[PDB]
């Protein structure tokens, strides 16, 4: 069995083992990696997104496994494309983060598993400082990738 907490901890330390029994779990319960219960109820963060924050050397293969699991249930598209919902990071996707981190490899990977390239990150974190701040590029992956000189 797996609750939200269980996976998020596994992800935090790049553990691909504690997620050995993962796929077969939501096969029995037919639960989806995308269920309401597998996201933070106030931000909309998913395990893939936790993984995106918990990088070590711009690397995490909990990602590769996490994606793999989502296709086997074909949560695939809406999984890789889930966005933040809090006023701060609203509309931020994993692809936004990969770029923010200047990580070709993870941009490449996300685009190949079908990240929406037109997804607008539009929360207060992506507009001019309250100061909050900060910082605006606006919104769309291309725009980001240019404004950060990439």
């Amino acid at each position: 069995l797996y609750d939200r907490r269980s996976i998020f901890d596994a992800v935090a330390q790049s553990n691909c083992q504690e997620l050995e029994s993962l796929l077969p779990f939501l096969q029995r319960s037919k639960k989806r990696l995308t269920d309401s219960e597998f996201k933070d109820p106030e931000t909309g963060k998913t395990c893939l997104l936790k993984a995106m924050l918990n990088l070590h050397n711009g690397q995490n293969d909990t990602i590769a496994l996490l994606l793999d699991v989502a296709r086997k249930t074909d949560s695939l598209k809406q999984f890789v494309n889930a966005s933040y919902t809090d006023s701060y990071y609203k509309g931020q996707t994993a692809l936004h983060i990969a770029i923010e981190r200047r990580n070709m490899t993870l941009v490449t990977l996300l685009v190949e598993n079908g990240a929406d390239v037109q997804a607008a990150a539009n929360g207060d974190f992506f507009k001019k400082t309250k100061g909050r701040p900060g910082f605006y590029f606006g919104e769309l992956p291309l725009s980001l990738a240019a404004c950060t000189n990439q």
Partner: protein, 148 residues
Amino acid sequence: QQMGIYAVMIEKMILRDLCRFMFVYLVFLFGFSTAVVTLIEDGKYNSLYSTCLELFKFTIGMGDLEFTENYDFKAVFIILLLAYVILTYILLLNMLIALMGETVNKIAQESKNIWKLQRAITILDTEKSFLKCMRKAXXXXXXXXXXX
């Protein structure tokens, strides 16, 4: 900020520049005024203070030039007054302006520091001098330079 920085210049200007011009001005005015009192027998321009006040007007812009008739050897009195004006009204007043121009150039960055200091002292005191009433007591600065 605009007015406060300006006030610093007035204070800076006053003591050093104004103070320096004042000494020489008192010295010149005193000497010449004494020379004049000796010169005049009668008519109330004899009194040192009275002559001195008449001598001051030259500096104000109200100088009378030949204020008093009742002096002897008249050409000398005029010579005394012309010399006082040349060295003292023109040479000094115009000099004071140039020297003021100097204090101003040197100060301004310094006078911004002084203004900054003055706000700090006023603020620090009110909180201490504000009863040390409940008040804040984390600093961070929003930053964004690349450098990336």
